[PDB]
Structure 1
Amino acid sequence: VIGLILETDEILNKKLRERKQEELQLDYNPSTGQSSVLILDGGMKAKPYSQISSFKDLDFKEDIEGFNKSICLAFGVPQVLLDGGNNANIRPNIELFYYMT
């Protein structure tokens, strides 16, 4: 994860560059820091980057639910017994499980 990308076309003193990387990261965090405004002097720019691979494309709920349901189907245990439900769901499912399986 990245918060800010700053670009310059000159070789600006690697050591103090890393020091400023630490300083900005510490200062601009609202949990530990009280700064909001940034001034860029000397020609340094800010590249408007985006996020390439996010965690919202990985939607794995339906597949995992399907695998669990299919395993429960294979053994024969009704899903209501594992999850739990109302009385009309509780007792007939218990009878169906015991008898049929």
Structure 2
Amino acid sequence: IGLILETDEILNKKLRERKQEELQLDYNPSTGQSSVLILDGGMKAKPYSQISSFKDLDFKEDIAGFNKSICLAFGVPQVLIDGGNNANIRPNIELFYYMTI
């Protein structure tokens, strides 16, 4: 939601819908220029907040754990999934070959 406006009056539905589309197209900087808004006749702007946010879906470590489990069940080092430095890479191939295969 971008904005909430509120009244105790009853408003003509067709004109209300038109007004919503005018505000939406005018205020966005991509579409339109206008930015100040003047309310009259008692329309009130209602403050609100994002009651549930994408920020709380910090899955990132849990899925990483599952990837490690899968990678571990076969027994392939992560350096082979990434590629690292020389000192990492050349011994890890021998690790993978000798221990697993």
TM-score (structure 1 length as normaliser): 0.97
Structure-2 separation of matches of 1:80 and 1:50 = 44
The superposition leaves residues 28-61 of structure 1 with CA deviations (integer Å, 9 ceiling, x where unpaired) of 0001100110000000000001001110000010
Structure-1 separation of matches of 2:79 and 2:37 = 57
Counterpart for residue 95 of structure 2: 96
Report the count of equivalent residues.
Answer: 100
1:56 alignment partner, SS class: helix
2:34 alignment partner, SS class: coil
1:10 alignment partner, SS class: coil
CA RMSD of superposed structures (Å):
0.5
Structure-2 separation of matches of 1:22 and 1:46 = 17
Structure-1 separation of matches of 2:17 and 2:98 = 71
Determine what percentage of the aligned residue pairs are the same residue.
Answer: 98
2:72 alignment partner, SS class: helix
Structure-1 separation of matches of 2:89 and 2:30 = 49
Structure-1 separation of matches of 2:21 and 2:97 = 64
* Structure 1 residue 19, shift from structure 2 partner: 0.4
TM-score (structure 2 length as normaliser): 0.97
Unaligned runs of 5+ in 2: none
The superposition leaves residues 70-101 of structure 1 with CA deviations (integer Å, 9 ceiling, x where unpaired) of 11111101000001100011011110001100
2:11 alignment partner, SS class: coil
